[PDB]
Each structure stands twice: as structure tokens, then as C-alpha cells.
Amino acid sequence: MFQQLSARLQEAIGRLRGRGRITEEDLKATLREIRRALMDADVNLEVARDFVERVREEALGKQVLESLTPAEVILATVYEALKEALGGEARLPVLKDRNLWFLVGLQGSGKTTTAAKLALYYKGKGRRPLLVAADTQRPAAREQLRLLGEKVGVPVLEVMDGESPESIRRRVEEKARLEARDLILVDTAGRLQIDEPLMGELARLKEVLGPDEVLLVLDAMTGQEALSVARAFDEKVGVTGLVLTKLDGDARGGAALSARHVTGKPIYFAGVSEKPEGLEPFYPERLAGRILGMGDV
Ligand SMILES: Nc1nc2c(ncn2[C@@H]2O[C@H](COP(=O)(O)OP(=O)(O)CP(=O)(O)O)[C@@H](O)[C@H]2O)c(=O)[nH]1
Numbered sequence: 308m309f310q311q312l313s314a315r316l317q318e319a320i321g322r323l324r325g326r327g328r329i330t331e332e333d334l335k336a337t338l339r340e341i342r343r344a345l346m347d348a349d350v351n352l353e354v355a356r357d358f359v360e361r362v363r364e365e366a367l368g369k370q371v372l373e374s375l376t377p378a379e380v381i382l383a384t385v386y387e388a389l390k391e392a393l394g395g396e397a398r399l400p401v402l403k404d405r406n407l408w409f410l411v412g413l414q415g416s417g418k419t420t421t422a423a424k425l426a427l428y429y430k431g432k433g434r435r436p437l438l439v440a441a442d443t444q445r446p447a448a449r450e451q452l453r454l455l456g457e458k459v460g461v462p463v464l465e466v467m468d469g470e471s472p473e474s475i476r477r478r479v480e481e482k483a484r485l486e487a488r489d490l491i492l493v494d495t496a497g498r499l500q501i502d503e504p505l506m507g508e509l510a511r512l513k514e515v516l517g518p519d520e521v522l523l524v525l526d527a528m529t530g531q532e533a534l535s536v537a538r539a540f541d542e543k544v545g546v547t548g549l550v551l552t553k554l555d556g557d558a559r560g561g562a563a564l565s566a567r568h569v570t571g572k573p574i575y576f577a578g579v580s581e582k583p584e585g586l587e588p589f590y591p592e593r594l595a596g597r598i599l600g601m602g603d604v
């Protein structure tokens with residue numbers, strides 16, 4: 308993800324090299340080019356306009372027009388604007404004494420495999436996780452998480468067909484007490500679209516289990532639809548943070564860039580492969596530097 312945009316931002320910056328100091332009109336040209344690059348990456352007009360305005364202000368504050376290397380000033384101000392757009396400071400969930408967390412999202416989002424890779428990440432950090440396969444319609448969606456829990460050495464509780472939220476709560480509390488579980492990761496059901504009985508069911512489970520966090524797992528390769536999905540889940544269920552998967556995929560990147568400010572939720576993790584190990588903390592500085600061709604490729 309972000310190939311064309313990364314190329315197009317780098318090319319805009321590169322066009323400023325070797326020319327001496329630049330003029331006001333030269334700066335305006337570069338700024339429209341950044342705005343176009345963003346919009347071609349599917350950033351909407353308002354977010355792209357805000358981004359460019361930030362770059363303009365910052366670059367003028369660094370006296371870009373008086374620099375012998377204006378490309379470097381633009382690189383720095385684009386970098387920072389990208390970092391800020393992606394969230395600024397890296398963030399994660401608060402771990403406290405009791406940690407019960409929902410993973411929500413659509414079919415194909417990376418939800419179930421993210422649950423398992425999350426289980427493993429936290430086990431490696433000294434937590435003691437329990438995975439809950441919470442689709443009460445589909446034995447095979449539950450199964451799938453079972454075999455991923457075995458892979459990663461993290462225990463699993465599968466809900467029964469049609470199980471009530473109160474029984475789930477009981478069986479989960481019983482197992483958590485018996486097994487000393489101190490991070491319960493609830494893999495809510497995945498469908499192809501927003502199943503409305505689905506959203507209601509999920510809201511009821513949420514009222515009953517009272518999760519500390521509700522993590523919505525979004526496939527980055529699906530585009531602007533992701534931010535509509537985010538709004539829908541936040542309004543029908545209520546979500547506390549994001550995970551963006553398939554950032555290793557080939558796709559534009561503009562919605563991901565816009566997600567922090569559009570959804571108002573932190574991005575805690577990004578999935579970077581199909582493997583259990585392929586989910587790591589989301590580091591706004593790292594994707595931003597990367598996008599601009601700095602650091603480790
Ligand atoms: N390349 C890549 N593939 C991913 C990533 N996360 C998940 N996938 C893949 O996406 C597909 C969908 O996974 P997932 O959504 O977890 O399972 P599912 O079978 O659709 C069930 P649900 O969506 O309800 O969790 C799987 O093939 C999985 O390997 C990622 O970060 N990168």
C-alpha cells in the first residue's frame with residue numbers, strides 16, 4: 308500500500324532540487340502537486356486541503372523560500388504532516404487489571420487472524436489471554452479461531468449456537484477465573500455486509516460484557532469504504548480503537564491516511580501479513596518516514 312502516492316510525493320519533492328532558491332509561485336505549484344497526489348490516493352478534498360494548508364504554514368515558518376535546499380524543507384514538513392495525519396504519537400490500549408476487548412468488523416477484514424496475532428503479541432509481553440470465538444451462528448468461524456489459538460499457544464472458548472450474552476459472560480468468567488486469564492479477546496462474528504440483526508446482537512453482547520475496548524479491524528485494501536464501515540460500527544456499536552490490516556497489500560492508502568481524523572479513533576495496530584507474527588504496533592512516524600523514502604525501505 309501507498310506505492311503511487313509515495314512515488315508521487317517523492318517526485319514532487321525531487322522536482323525542487325537543483326534549482327536554487329524558489330519563488331512563491333514555485334511553492335504554490337509544489338503544494339497543488341501534493342494535494343493532487345493525496346487526492347489520487349483517494350484522500351477527500353477537505354482532508355487533502357487541510358494537509359496542504361498545514362504543509363504551507365509549516366514550510367513558510369521554516370522560511371522555505373529563503374532556503375538553499377527547499378526540497379529538504381518540504382520533505383520535513385510533509386513528513387510531519389503525514390505523521391500527524393496518521394496519529395502522531397504511537398498509541399496502544401491501556402492494560403489495567405481487567406481487560407476484556409472486542410474485535411469487530413466485516414468478513415474479510417482480518418478480524419479473526421488479528422485476534423490470534425493479538426493474543427500472541429500480548430502473551431509475548433507477559434499477559435495471559437483468552438480468545439472468545441463469539442459467532443453464535445457459525446461453528447466454522449469459531450473453529451477457525453480454535454486452530455489459530457492452538458497455533459499460537461493461546462487458549463480458546465467457543466460460544467454455542469444461539470448462546471445468550473449472559474451464558475457467554477458466565478462461561479467466560481468461569482474459565483477466566485479457573486485459568487487466570489487477564490486479557491479476554493472477543494472475536495465477534497464476521498459477515499460480508501453490516502448485518503443489522505448482527506449490529507443489534509453485537510450491541511447487546513457489548514452491553515452485557517462491557518468491554519474496555521472495542522477494536523474495529525479494517526482491511527486497508529478496501530479503500531474509503533473502510534471509513535464508512537468505521538462510522539457505522541461506531542454509531543451502532545461504539546468502538547474505541549482501530550486495527551488496519553493488509554497494509555502489505557497493493558492499494559492506494561488515502562483512506563488509511565484519513566482514518567485517524569475522520570473516525571476520531573486511534574490506530575493501535577497494523578497487520579502486515581497473513582502470518583500470526585504479522586501484526587505490530589502502528590507507528591505513525593514509521594509509515595510517514597517510509598512513505599517519503601526515508602529509513603528502512
Ligand atoms: N496480506 C494480509 N492478509 C491478511 C492480513 N490480515 C488478515 N489477512 C487475510 O485475510 C483473510 C481474511 O481473514 P479474517 O478476516 O481474519 O478471517 P475470515 O475467515 O474472513 C472470518 P472474520 O472476517 O469474520 O474474522 C485471510 O486469508 C487472512 O489470512 C494482513 O495483515 N495482511
Ligand SMILES: [Ca+2]
Binds near residue numbers: 510511514
Ligand atoms: Ca439494549
Ligand SMILES: [Ca+2]
Binds near residue numbers: 600601602
Ligand atoms: Ca536513505
